[PDB]
Amino acid sequence: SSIGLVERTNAALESSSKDLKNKILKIKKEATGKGVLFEAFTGLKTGSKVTSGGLALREAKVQAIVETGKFLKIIEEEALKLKETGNSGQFLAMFDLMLEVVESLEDVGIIGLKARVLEESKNNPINTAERLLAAKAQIENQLKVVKEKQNIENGGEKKNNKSKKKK
């Protein structure tokens, strides 16, 4: 019934992918170790909690992308194969997949410009492989730009309440 392989083959690799958004569960404990609280995020006036979290909480938001970059490199050799299949049905899931792993990061105050990547496929028809690599090239290229944001915040990281940003 099986020869060391797996059902539906590991092609989709969607099984291990689900372990990504869940892998964070570990990155969360990191801060907790420093006696950090997930309740004093931002809003408790932060009058006495003047950044009481320390740099141990900010480094956590970054430790994630680092883990994702590792798993993301694995998908490269996965989609590259579908090149022969070119099955939009199977390729379509990939597009929604690479973007999904970015949805669980929102739990760590991480908000990439993914929402913007959605229009990318809307403008250009994504039903092939070759071109697909074009969509990813942006994901990895953009992610590496997010990490640099750790220069000194005052922007994407820790958004100011005054900055409504809605227009």
Swiss-Prot record:
InterPro entries with a match to the protein in the record: Decorin-bd, Decorin-Binding, Decorin-db_sf
One Pfam family here: Decorin_bind
Record keyword Signal present: yes
Keyword Thylakoid found: no
Keywords associated with the record: Plasmid, Signal
Family membership: Belongs to the decorin-binding protein family.
Function: Binds to decorin which may mediate the adherence of B.burgdorferi to collagen fibers in skin and other tissues.
Entry protein name: Decorin-binding protein B
Organism per entry: Borreliella burgdorferi (strain ATCC 35210 / DSM 4680 / CIP 102532 / B31) (Borrelia burgdorferi)
Gene (UniProt): dbpB
